[PDB]
Each structure stands twice: as C-alpha cells, then as structure tokens.
Symmetry: D2
Subunit: 220 residues, 4 copies
C-alpha cells in the first residue's frame, strides 16, 4: 500500500547550459525519505570538465526527502506514486541568474528525475566562474501558498575563499501531478547540503542533503 | 558582565510613512540570556496610525537572543558601550522602509533611539488598508559583509484571506566599542507577536523571542 | 577597424526552441531589415507547441542589436562584431515572480543573419497576465548600454500594457560578447526601443513582429 | 491657468541622515519650467564635510521643470498653485538603500521644497562612502500610473573612477495636493543632472538639471 518506503533509490539525469557551456550530468543515489537524508553519486557525461563552480548545481540535484512532523502537511510524500515537478529561479547578487526544472516520477523503490538547468550573465571575475566557492551554508526555506501553488523562498549564501559570502535568492514552485493533493499551511524547512567527496575536475561528485520541517519558534 | 538576567527597556521612536509623522514610546522588560522580551507601546503622536502597525514591530535589539556557547555573541559583548543598526525593508508591492536604532545602557535599563521611514506604499495595499494579521516566524542569516556583521531575512506577513505578504530585510550592526570580535556565519530564529492592542492601535503590547543556532544538524 | 560586410538590406533567419511553465515549443523566423536605419521586420511561425498557453509578448524581445541606428560618435560594438558575429545572454525579471533567461547565437553568411535562440521561463502565476494572456503592448523603453566586468551590458526598465490600463513591470539585463577579438568597447550610451506586433492570427501561431532601435547619448545631445 | 511663470525662483532646505550622519543643506536657484531647465547653488549648513558621495543627493535637489509637449498631460504644472509632494526609494546594487520625500508649495514667484533624505547599509569600501563617483549619466524616467498614483521608475547609473558604473534602481510616487487632477498616460522623461562646480569637500555645489518629456519612438 505504502507509496513511500523507508529506503528508496534515486535515478537522475541533468542536462544544462551555463554561459553557453552545455553539460550532461548523471546521478545514482539512495535515501531515507522519512528521515530527510539522501546521498547521490554524480558523473558529468558531456562538457567535462565544467568551467563553473559545481555548487550552483547542487540544489537542483526532491523534497520528498525531508522529515515532516505530524502537525505539518507533507505535500511531497502525498504526491506519489504519480509524482510531481518543480520550477526554480536562482538570483545571485552579482547578476548571475539561473532557472531550473525537475520532473520527478516513481517506479517501485526508485525516483526518476528529469532535471534541466540554465544560467546566464555570470561574470568572468565572479566567484562562480573563478571557482572560489566552498559550500552552501545551512539554510531555512519558507513554505507557503501563492496563487494556489505551494511556493518556497530561500535566502541563501555560498561560502567563498577568504571568509566571504556570496548571496543567492531562490524561489521554487511545486506542483503535484495528481489533482486534489492537500496544500500545506505555512511552515519552515531547514536545509543542509554538502559535497562529501570529488575528484579534481568535479567529474565525479558525491552529494548529501539533510532536510527537516518545523513551525519555527517556539514550536521547534 | 554588563548585562543582568533581567533588564528594563525604554524606546523612543519617531517616524514617517506616506507623509504621516508619528511618535511612539515603549516601556517594557526582558531576559536577554533567555532570548525573550516584552514591551508596552503608546502612540503619543500621529494616532490613529493610517497604516498596519505590524510593519513597525521589527523596529521595536538582538541582545535579547539566546546565543549558545559555540557562537560569538556580538550583541552582548557590545555593552556597556552599546551598538547601532541600520535596516532596509523591501516589500513585494514596492513599499520600501528604512530604519535605524541607537542602543545604550545606563544601569540596568536599555535605551533605544529608533527612527523609521517608509515610502511608496500602494493605497489599496495590505499596509495602508490594514489587511495584515501577524509576522510569520522567520530565520535571520548572520554573516560578515565588508567588515560589518549583516543580518538578512526573508520574512512573510500573514494577511486576511489566507495570503502572505513578502518582505526582504537587511540589517547592518555596528558596535560602538572598537575591537568587538565579529562572529562567524550563524542563524537567528525569530518569532514576534502582538499580544494585545486597542481598536485604533494606539496602545499595543509587543513580544519577541530569538534563538541563535548553527543550523542543521547542530540545532 | 575593418569592413563590417553588412549591406544596407539584410535578411534574418531565426529558429527558437524554448520552454515556459513546463510547456515546450519551437518557433521559426523569416524576415528582413535595415541595420543602418535600426529597423527590422520578421514573420514568426510556431512549428511545435502551438498554441502557446502564455502571452506571446514575453518572447518578442528574444526575436539582434545590429539593427540599431548608431551615430558615428558612438562606438557600434555590434556592427563591427561581424562578419565573425556575436552572441548575447539575457535575464527577464517580472514583478510577480516570473523569471526568464534567454540566449542568442548570431552569425552572418552572405546576405542573411542567423539566430539560434533559446528561451526559458519559470514561476509565472497561473492567474497572472502572462499565463492568462492579458498582455497588449510593449511600451517604448530605453536600454542603458555600458561596460560591466569587462563586458558590454544593457539594462532596461520595461513595461507591458495590460487590459484595463495597467502596466506590467519587467527588468532586463543583456550581456553581449563578440566572437572575434579586437572589437572596441563603447562608452555609456542609451538605446531607444519600440517593438510592435503588427499582425497575427487568433492563437498567435503566426505573428508579424517589428522593431525600431536608435542609439544616442541622452540630453542635451540627442 | 496655473499661474506658473516662465522664469521662477527656487528655495530649498534638505535635512538628511545617511549612514548615521545627520546633515543640513540649503538650496537657492532659478529655473525655466517650459524649457525644463534649472540651476541651483547648494550650501552645507550642517554635517559638513559630508563623509559620503554628494552625487547620491543631487537627484533629490521638482518635475515642473520639465519640457512637456502638447500630446502629453503635464500632471506637475496642473498641480499648482496648490502644489504637490513626492516620495522616492533609491536602491543601489551594493545594498545601499535610500528614501526621500519633498513637499513643494508655491508662494508667488518662488518654488519652495521641503526635502528629506535617508540612507542606510552603504558598504564602507563602496564607491559612495569612498567618494568614487564622478557623475550621474543621463537617463530616462518611465512615467505611468500604478494604483491610481503617478509613478516613475528609472534605471540610472553613476559613473565611477576608471569609467566603471554603479547601478541604482529608483521609484518615485507623485501626488498632487488638489483632488481630481487628471493623470497622464505612459510617457518618458529624459534626464541629465550635472554638478557645474564645487568646493574641496562639496560644501558649496552648483547644480543643473535638464528634463524633456516625450512618448518614445518614433515620436523621439
Ligand atoms: O554540511 S554537512 O553538515 O552535511
Ligand atoms: O511564544 S508566544 O508565541 O506565545
Ligand atoms: O545637462 S547638462 O549636463 O549639460
Ligand atoms: O517605428 S514606429 O513604427 O514605432
């Protein structure tokens, strides 16, 4: 009966374009949906080595991996077996702007992800093209309903070389495939994403994320 | 050393939104180390306010935040000298607000010289029409930007009709005593609430609670 | 410093592949124009994805700055970018959250320019003017051309006229990069724009587009 | 039918607070409304010398000084003799944000301007606090009505040392004092502001503006 199982697999294919540079990246990972933890092994098939910081791709690599408590409606786990899809905009503080789409589907213990990524106006001397990023700092997403659609806004920062921070503002719009899926009320989703390991050219990447939902102070 | 477990709070706030001057006085208390604080507010001039009182609340001290041991408390170490902050509020309908505050301490009480200015609020907007309900809980991102500690918040106002209203805020904190160590990147959980008020919002009770943390998985 | 190889009467060969709100489409373009008068006209034709569930207007500026009246006192970065050609990247930010990215690779071969165009929009509200197709007209705008991070960049403040006398704000930044080296960067200058849909069918499967652009250096010398 | 003379005098006094620095500037000049030109001598009464770039203030130092054609409704000259007021937000690309107000009342032959200005969050090493600005480039104001109010949005740029540019996005709201003043349609207003002369620390500044209203191409 259960559409969401304790241990599930993740199959992902990304096709993208940043500043004209086409790229194709494959993923194959595992995760625990009810614990909000997933890990994935990536491998760029085309366009390696990448000319930009790999970090800007990480959040495009499923909120069905998040620990939802009882008092908050879990929109994403209720979206399967049919699945869902999202759209995202990434506005960086130095002009660089990205859009991204993902169409998620399920078969058995496996999620399938059709991911698209596009970025423009990234300056050559910028920390993205200079590859001076280190990690995404831990963040907190704001979930709320906007125009009948579950939307998530995140203020977010990249750690740069030299104790500097690089600002990125994101908006995601989630839409279930099935009709009649209960939209949740306002809530927060704490995030944490990390590159566990990589080779020199970032042709091989192991990514890990942890996400938890809550109602904020003083409920958490 | 300079901050007692219980403190008194005094706040004078003059402002202008859409050409409307106003003067508000605040007298309340709070326990800094526990991260909680309360305050009674009175519109001594400009009442009744033709705009939603909620936009003023965040202007009405991060020293009232529960900081752990593993995170540098830049605000509690800014005393007895005190500190200042500037702020910019950017609402989604075009309304822009700026604010500043000088925080001092003579004895056991906190003195706050706050100013507030807001422009370009739409007439039928949820602010000038008082369609707001409360500030939804948020998370401030603390990080050093150009040698100055900076807090950025994506906060949302709950409106009437189960709708939310966007506001992006950037605050720059500056300690008076030169030498106060800047903290690393960290988060500050926030929850603000109007506990009680009258019809025309002349007398208002405000309450806050702030907890600092390292985020996942250290929170 | 060399011959632009751009004759006063040029042709345009365009093909756009794009995605908006998950909806995929393919559009082809055929038109003519005069680079020295800063005027051009094109016949668009939705090959795939028709009919478009969104406003056609958001696509129109994606459908070449080589068609702009540049005075000889202002450096014409685009005309001197040929015969090698150039390419641009653009971000479109609407006031309701909708964000578009677009890029065009422009080449010249003989008498005709060629455009490989891509367009991507996200986060448009279901009841916004775009998805409801309540747009009417691109108001005349002025693009601010200047070198930024060693790259010629243009910033505009655009507005769509809606039904009911309302305006739909949009902020656009375009970056321009030449394929050949040695092309001189211009100083700050303005570019006046006026794009207009002259004719179309009901479902906008076939559209007739027109642009007129004139560069200048603002008051008082304009 | 508005009692606006071809040659008018301008009286002005600004009180402001940028970066915590309080200041007072007085202004006295003349202008030609139907030719859209105006000149003004400025004097720093308090706060001198200003620790920030003077250029960020000049845009605040009256749109009746704009040449309007006959096919465009001149909302500003139709607001007198009762006068009008405006509000403005200045958003810079580096985080610096300014608000500004002015109440304009006409007393016979002289225009009076009660101006207020406030600026926050300017980086210590930005071109403003370092005073690296050279001038405002000529721009174009997009006038249109939003929620029953005349509004102008401008993409303007400050020329910096080395011929770099410093972006600023601005929005102004105009409100006539008298009820039922006919709102104009979408039109453009070309601007140029130029500091003609100044003293060492900008305590005395000669300012000039030239504004012309039009309806864009091909009317240009
Ligand atoms: O970033 S780490 O905590 O996964
Ligand atoms: O803690 S308060 O929200 O009751
Ligand atoms: O308008 S002034 O810059 O000649
Ligand atoms: O160029 S005219 O047709 O707007």
């Amino acid at each position: 009966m259960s559409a969401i199982k304790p241990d599930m697999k993740i199959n992902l294919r990304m096709e993208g374009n940043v500043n004209g540079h086409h790229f194709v990246i494959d993923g194959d990972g595992t995760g625990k949906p009810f614990e909000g933890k997933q890990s994935m092994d990536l491998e760029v098939k085309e366009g390696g080595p990448l000319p930009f910081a790999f970090d800007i791709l990480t959040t495009a690599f499923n909120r069905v991996f998040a620990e939802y408590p009882d008092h908050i409606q879990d929109y994403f786990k209720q979206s399967f077996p049919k699945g869902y899809s999202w759209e995202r905009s990434l506005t960086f503080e130095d002009g660089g702007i990205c859009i991204a789409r993902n169409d998620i589907t399920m078969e058995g213990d496996t999620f399938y992800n059709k991911v698209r990524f596009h970025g423009v106006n990234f300056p050559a001397n910028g920390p993205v093209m200079q590859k001076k990023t280190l990690k995404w700092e831990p963040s907190t997403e704001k979930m709320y309903v906007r125009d009948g659609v579950l939307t998530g806004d995140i203020t977010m920062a990249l750690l740069l070389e030299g104790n500097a921070h690089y600002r990125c503002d994101s908006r995601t719009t989630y839409k279930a495939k099935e009709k009649g899926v209960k939209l949740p009320g306002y809530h927060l989703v704490d995030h944490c994403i990390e590159i566990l390991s990589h080779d020199k050219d970032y042709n091989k990447v192991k990514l890990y994320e942890h996400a938890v939902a809550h109602s904020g102070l003083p409920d958490n």
